[PDB]
Amino acid sequence: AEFRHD
């Protein structure tokens, strides 16, 4: 689970 903006 990667982090993504918005």
Epitope: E2, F3, R4, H5
Partner: antibody, heavy 124, light 108 residues
Framework: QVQLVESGGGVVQPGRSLRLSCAAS????????MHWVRQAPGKGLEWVAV????????YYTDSVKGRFTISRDNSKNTLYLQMNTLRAEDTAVYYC?????????????????WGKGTTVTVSS | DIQMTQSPSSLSASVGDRVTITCRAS??????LNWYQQKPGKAPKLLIY???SLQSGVPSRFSGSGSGTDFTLTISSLQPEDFATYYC?????????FGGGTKVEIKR
């Protein structure tokens, strides 16, 4: 005088471990996210890992998942990188960098302050 | 994972010239694009964040433009100190990725 100072680098054999440290001074450490960025000899910049300001979220580049662990001790103003099961291709200069963050969750934005770096050589 | 393609990998220029570099992203990163300068043996230095915002203290000659997938770094009139390597970096989603680097060398 805001400073980031890496230490812990050296010569290490493949499959062995190394702990990098990064001592922060001159600002509010526990309010910034921190990154580890590396540069293999003669190559470009490669992102390694980020840890949130509160130490609650951690992300890693794929080639180091399950081998590297990023941690922080906000009390000691110190960032750490635990490097297990080292390979030759981990040979690089390692930099820590602070990231202020953006958005509601304070995810990465930009890296305005860097350390001078510490050199890791993985060789038998 | 987003790929950052930087072009050209090298270029020659002389003092006073206008130089531009390009970073292209394999998919939209909105405007979470940063530009760094690095000289041999030294740590990177942030020049531009958020595609166009300029880091406090950086000369006014440096400018950046772009959104989505195409981005530009501009030096208005070159200076002797500017001959260095420039990397772009997307800050939209992990894993964070840098471009390959663009070396700015002295023309002769």
């Amino acid at each position: 005088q805001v400073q980031l100072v890496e230490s812990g680098g050296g010569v290490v054999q493949p499959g062995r471990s190394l702990r990098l440290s990064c001592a922060a001074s001159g600002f509010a450490f526990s309010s910034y996210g921190m990154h580890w960025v590396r540069q293999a000899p003669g190559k470009g910049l490669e992102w390694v890992a980020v840890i949130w300001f509160d130490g609650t979220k951690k992300y890693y580049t794929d080639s180091v998942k399950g081998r590297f662990t990023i941690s922080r001790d906000n009390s000691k103003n110190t960032l750490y990188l635990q490097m297990n099961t080292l390979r030759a291709e981990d040979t690089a200069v390692y930099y820590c960098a602070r990231d202020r963050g953006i958005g509601a969750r304070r995810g990465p934005y930009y890296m305005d302050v860097w350390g001078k770096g510490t050199t890791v050589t993985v060789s038998s | 994972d987003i790929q950052m393609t930087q072009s050209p990998s090298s270029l020659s220029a002389s003092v006073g010239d206008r130089v531009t570099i390009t970073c292209r992203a394999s998919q939209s990163i909105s405007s979470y694009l940063n530009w760094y300068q690095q000289k041999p043996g030294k740590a990177p230095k942030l020049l531009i964040y958020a595609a166009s915002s300029l880091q406090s203290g950086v000369p006014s000659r440096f400018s950046g433009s772009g959104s989505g997938t195409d981005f530009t770094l501009t030096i208005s009139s070159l200076q002797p100190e500017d001959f260095a390597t420039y990397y772009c970096q997307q800050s939209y989603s992990t894993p964070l990725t840098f471009g390959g680097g663009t070396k700015v060398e002295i023309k002769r």
